[PDB]
Ligand binder design. Sequence first.
Ligand SMILES: Nc1ncnc2c1ncn2[C@@H]1O[C@H](CSCC[C@H](N)C(=O)O)[C@@H](O)[C@H]1O
Ligand SMILES: O=S(=O)(Nc1ccc(Cl)cc1)c1ccc2c(c1)CN[C@@H](CO)C2
Length: 257
Amino acid sequence: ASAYQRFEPRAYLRNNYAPPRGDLCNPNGVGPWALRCLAQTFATGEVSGRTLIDIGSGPTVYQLLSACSHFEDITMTDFLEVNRQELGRWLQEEPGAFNWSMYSQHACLIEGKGECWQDKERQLRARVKRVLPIDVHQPQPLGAGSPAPLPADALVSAFCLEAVSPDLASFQRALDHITTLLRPGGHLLLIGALEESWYLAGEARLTVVPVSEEEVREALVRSGYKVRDLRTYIMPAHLQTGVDDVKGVFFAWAQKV
Ligand SMILES: Nc1ncnc2c1ncn2[C@@H]1O[C@H](CSCC[C@H](N)C(=O)O)[C@@H](O)[C@H]1O
Ligand SMILES: O=S(=O)(Nc1ccc(Cl)cc1)c1ccc2c(c1)CN[C@@H](CO)C2
């Protein structure tokens, strides 16, 4: 918790979204696999509506590339002021923003609608109406007077919950907490670290709750979801870089009610 105070966005970004973990050329990498999961899910046309909320966005945008064309009102969030500012830098095309163009181009490539990557980033930037502070540890994650439309038609969260929970029980609560923001029948797209206990973000050393696919599955069910899809990407040896001890990555498409 207080460890997130030393959390450096730039260090987080190069540890996870820059080579080798960031390479998108090899189809066997984690990046290609994750964008595929997201793109395919939205391609079924079943995950749709008007508003969407991204839980604990951190300083990344890749988790919304395929999503942005299905929701006109997008709300991004994060606990740390520093991450919200890193997002602004990219959203406002300000100086020193992280370059996600490779991810955009790959999203367009995977989506196969012949869209150019500039049009993709243009649309995402347009639909992101706000970058709000948030705390999944609060029964009301966003708060009282949330400028964000509620209940949202859909939610997206990547690598957040397990990274802010010390144990399985906390994980469940945080999931119950954010679940309240979702409209019954709505959809949840959850991505996270499998069996990880720590990860570095510069001077910050964060503790993580090691979870398994079945634990995630069971937790989604407990929060009142109907697991539409749950996949696992096992982390290959060469993506084991010393920035954490993650064993794999999971993708979950869950529906509320
Ligand atoms: N109590 C809390 N509630 C919500 N988010 C929190 C939190 N404590 C920390 N976080 C945020 O959770 C994130 C975990 S890292 C995941 C970042 C991004 N979603 C990605 O896919 O890479 C960080 O951005 C961190 O600032
Ligand atoms: O899968 S990754 O190795 N990198 C990646 C993810 C998605 C795309 Cl699209 C590209 C690269 C990746 C990304 C974020 C985090 C990890 C791994 C593991 N640690 C979590 C925080 O606990 C945070």
